[PDB]
Design an enzyme around this catalytic site. Sequence first.
Site, short mmCIF file in Angstrom:
data_model
loop_
_atom_site.label_atom_id
_atom_site.label_comp_id
_atom_site.label_asym_id
_atom_site.label_seq_id
_atom_site.Cartn_x
_atom_site.Cartn_y
_atom_site.Cartn_z
N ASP A 155 29.99 30.28 45.21
CA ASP A 155 29.69 28.99 44.61
C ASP A 155 30.22 27.86 45.49
OD1 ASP A 155 32.37 29.00 43.98
OD2 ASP A 155 32.05 29.61 41.90
N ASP A 200 25.25 35.49 36.82
CA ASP A 200 26.67 35.78 37.00
C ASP A 200 27.37 35.29 35.75
OD1 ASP A 200 26.73 32.72 38.02
OD2 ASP A 200 28.76 33.33 37.45
N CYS A 248 33.20 56.46 30.25
CA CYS A 248 32.57 57.07 29.09
C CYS A 248 32.31 58.56 29.30
CB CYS A 248 31.30 56.30 28.74
SG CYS A 248 31.67 54.66 28.12
N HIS A 280 34.12 49.89 32.54
CA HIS A 280 33.02 50.14 31.62
C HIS A 280 32.14 48.90 31.47
CE1 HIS A 280 30.64 50.94 28.13
NE2 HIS A 280 31.08 49.78 27.68
N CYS A 304 26.31 55.29 27.59
CA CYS A 304 26.75 54.77 28.88
C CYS A 304 27.08 55.89 29.84
CB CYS A 304 27.99 53.91 28.66
SG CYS A 304 28.68 53.20 30.17
N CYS A 335 28.87 55.49 32.62
CA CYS A 335 29.98 55.15 33.50
C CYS A 335 31.07 56.22 33.47
CB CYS A 335 30.55 53.77 33.16
SG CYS A 335 31.91 53.73 31.92
ZN ZN Z 1 30.97 53.27 29.86
#
Ligand code: ZN
EC number: 2.4.2.29
Lengths: 356, 356
Positions: free
Chosen positions: A76, A251, A294, A320, A289, A291
Amino acid sequence: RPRFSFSIAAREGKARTGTIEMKRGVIRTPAFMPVGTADIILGNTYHLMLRPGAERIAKLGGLHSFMGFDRPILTDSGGYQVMSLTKQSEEGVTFKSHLDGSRHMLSPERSIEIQHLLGSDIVMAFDECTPYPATPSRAASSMERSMRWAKRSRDAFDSRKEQAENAALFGIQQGSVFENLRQQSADALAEIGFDGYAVGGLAVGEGQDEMFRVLDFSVPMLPDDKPHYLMGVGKPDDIVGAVERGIDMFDCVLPTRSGRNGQAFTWDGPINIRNARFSEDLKPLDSECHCAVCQKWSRAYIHHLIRAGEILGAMLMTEHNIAFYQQLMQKIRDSISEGRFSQFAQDFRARYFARN
Amino acid sequence: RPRFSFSIAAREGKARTGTIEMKRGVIRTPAFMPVGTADIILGNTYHLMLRPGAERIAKLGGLHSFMGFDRPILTDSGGYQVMSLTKQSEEGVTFKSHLDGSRHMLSPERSIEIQHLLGSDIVMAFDECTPYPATPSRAASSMERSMRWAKRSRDAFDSRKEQAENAALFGIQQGSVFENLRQQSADALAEIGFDGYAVGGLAVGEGQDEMFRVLDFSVPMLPDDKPHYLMGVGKPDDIVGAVERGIDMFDCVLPTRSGRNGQAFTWDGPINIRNARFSEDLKPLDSECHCAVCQKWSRAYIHHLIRAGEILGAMLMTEHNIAFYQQLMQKIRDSISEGRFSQFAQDFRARYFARN
Ligand SMILES: [Zn+2]
Ligand SMILES: [Zn+2]
């Protein structure tokens, strides 16, 4: 790869999916750009110019080398945090650093130079985020100055060979909530010419209905064949609705802020993991999820870590949340590419707001 | 694998290297056992019995399932933190929880039962860490009670079939700094019989010279053919000198505490990463360390993250510190196995204290 090439692979309504090719990598759109500290990440210019300083970052090899990240970085302009954390004039803004009291001026030219020293790949023109609410007169004055500053940003960027040849420059549409000012701003930016166009001034507390109303008329004013970046947005449902309105890039501090403050995003809405109801919940943060958190750990354990004050807990929540945001963007891109984004958006809202 | 089998593969002086085989895995010794939140990790019984509670942990499947760790876990008895964070008697200790005011008694029997509910693999007998300094009379009284409690711990453990058949029980030598009391304690523990023997009461502020003096006579009093665990120790040089004196197992809050407070361990001594001298230092935290942090990031970047208050900084420091401790233990084990531990210890001290 080229310096910059945006290609649209598929469309559904106003939504688009495609790619931005840059020297350091390909960015799949719609894209979410997480804070650096993903195909592209954000660098915080105001923070970096105060610690360690842009000249010091350049001495250390630029931001890519400094933080060990070799893909594209968007910076930015630094102007928003100057106001958030002063004397304004047509030249720029002067301000004092609370970190050590030092004096600093920030102008379009200096902002572009700082972003050059940081070595970012996408450079934002220096402008003002008009406060909200704003009267028409004040919104116009602010937008007009920002357009004069957009030309100065363009010229400063073009003067630096390494920057002009290897980075990209985005201009920022302002105009508050006023259609005529948004049009004047879009026209001025297109006349100057930029690689991409941000919609500025909409992360200002106006509420989703108003944000969407302004996006409805503002995004079509921008060149269709260039990326559209909605700065500072937002919650998952904000993102979905903004994509429905033609936005390609986002963002937001939310995934990291929430991750440090006990809030996890899930397909069934956000959850406050510190709440006692999670103390014995053996399910992962989200049961779809993918990830790493998880795959391995339960809500009950993450709840425990956060309640115990263990740094590991906030790290797992943040991992996560970032991954969730990226999975959201992946689902958006796949659904647009497959011609089922309208259905995805409806299904997403029904589940997210059910809060089951 | 057996429930418990300690084998010594090589020796040099009083130092030993070998393995403990247990049902859930093999532990290479000398071993460092990091806090769970490595071949084996530590669970904090006092903390866990207050949040979420031992019965709740058992309902969630035990500590291994709860924290997603399937290798051996050692739990302490809970008694030390009860005092650190009350009414003592021959039966045990009663105390009130600051978390919710609830009442709790902790006795040898209840400590063993809590550790059973947690499902740990190595269970510590319930005792008192005698304060330092202590008079001979007070040290004797404390040690004598702890030995009566060691027998009660033994009997409680043996009464629980699942525990007796699948876990191991360590007894704790007390006696403050007094050779005769250390001998009486060792004799009492050996008569009861344990799977391993801890040296207790030496992480109490006495200083390294005194600690080493007490270890010189105390460790030989323990059965040679069983593991020797120095509780709560320590700094890298403490560990090296304790191994030279026959210790096989260690635990200490230092790597994690330091990691959260800006201190990184290196082969050239600890460094305070927040110090300005690291702001432009492109070297990794340690230039020999094989950890993922040192493969990727510089001191300058970690310094920046910590100074910026980014959680990532403390996470990287902690990852490095834990990994450093494990690399220290690996170097210790290899040097004993190869018959060059005396040289390693001398070389280690020369470099670590040079502070280059
Ligand atoms: Zn997750
Ligand atoms: Zn390292």
